[PDB]
Amino acid sequence: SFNQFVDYTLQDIICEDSTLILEQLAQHTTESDNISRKYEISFGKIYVTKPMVNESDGVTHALYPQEARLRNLTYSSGLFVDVKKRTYEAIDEL
Amino acid sequence: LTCPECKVYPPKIVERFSEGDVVCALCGLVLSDKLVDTRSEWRTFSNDDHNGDDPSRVGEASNPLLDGNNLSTRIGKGETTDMRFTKELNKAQGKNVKDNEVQAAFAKITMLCDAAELPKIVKDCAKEAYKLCHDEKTLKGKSMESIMAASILIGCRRAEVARTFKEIQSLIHVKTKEFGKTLNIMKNI
DNA sequence: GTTGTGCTATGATATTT
RNA sequence: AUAUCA
DNA sequence: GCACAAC
Numbered sequence A: 001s002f003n004q005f006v007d008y009t010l011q012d013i014i015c016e017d018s019t020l021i022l023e024q025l026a027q028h029t030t031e032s033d034n035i036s037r038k039y040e041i042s043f044g045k046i047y048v049t050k051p052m053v054n055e056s057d058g059v060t061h062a063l064y065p066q067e068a069r070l071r072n073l074t075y076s077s078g079l080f081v082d083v084k085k086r087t088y089e090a091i092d093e094l
Numbered sequence B: 001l002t003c004p005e006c007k008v009y010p011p012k013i014v015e016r017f018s019e020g021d022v023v024c025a026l027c028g029l030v031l032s033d034k035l036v037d038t039r040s041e042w043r044t045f046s047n048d049d050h051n052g053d054d055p056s057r058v059g060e061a062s063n064p065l066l067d068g069n070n071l072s073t074r075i076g077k078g079e080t081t082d083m084r085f086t087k088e089l090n091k092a093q094g095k096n097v098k099d100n101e102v103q104a105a106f107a108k109i110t111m112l113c114d115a116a117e118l119p120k121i122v123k124d125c126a127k128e129a130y131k132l133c134h135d136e137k138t139l140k141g142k143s144m145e146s147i148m149a150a151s152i153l154i155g156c157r158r159a160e161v162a163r164t165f166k167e168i169q170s171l172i173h174v175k176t177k178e179f180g181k182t183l184n185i186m187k188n189i
Numbered sequence C: 001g002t003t004g005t006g007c008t009a010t011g012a013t014a015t016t017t
Numbered sequence D: 001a002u003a004u005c006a
Numbered sequence E: 001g002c003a004c005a006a007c
């Protein structure tokens, strides 16, 4: 079950709603008005490391199940996603 | 407490918790009989009960050091609830809402620590460093986004969380020499 | 006719934030 | 709050 | 989830 969720399910969750946009359309009075823009933020491939730990002194290193149980840590790994930020513009459709 | 019968200056007394008594170790006179369990009593304020079934859970813990004493519940949805009255009683809390608003600069510290991957003990030191130096005449008119950027390195330098000043220059913002002088006038306080 | 409103076994013990 | 005990 | 009580 877990494997299916990590290998597949996880990606599809990042891609359903995924991309979000914000549009700033002007007053069309005169410069500096009459400028309509639309900005994008997109989510691509999702990555997932082997389990790691972020100690108090910055250093990150691998973490084995035994060290987790003794130092009361969490046996978790990092989630990384490709992000892209596009920008668009029109004057007072293209 | 001091035994009324004996009275020796170092008053040697024991807390026989198990028999719920406070005894004088010398003469054996019981000095108190009503005795309360502080662990279990504290369990009534900070519990694991988030559902709401515990009859023992009857209070909540607060932080008088950071947010002073602002007791305030929140109007929210319950089991039998119309989504109308929640809106009205919440739109009514809007009309009842300067320095009682500068507490949103704690929301600036909390959102900075979580963007810097910082622990829960660091935020509460950065919030206490900021509360005790933001209205100082010794700081006077320093860059207001560089005095809270300096109180985060003050909170990290006690909680043993290694964060260079150039690491906080990447977060916000920091003007180097500006948040370096501010990191010293506060350090004296 | 529909809504709406009370309650639904005794004690005990062990963790988990 | 879960698990459990007769 | 009952089962009985009032709108």
Ligand SMILES: [Zn+2]
Pocket: B003, B004, B005, B006, B007, B024, B025, B026, B027, B028, B029
């Ligand atoms: Zn005595």
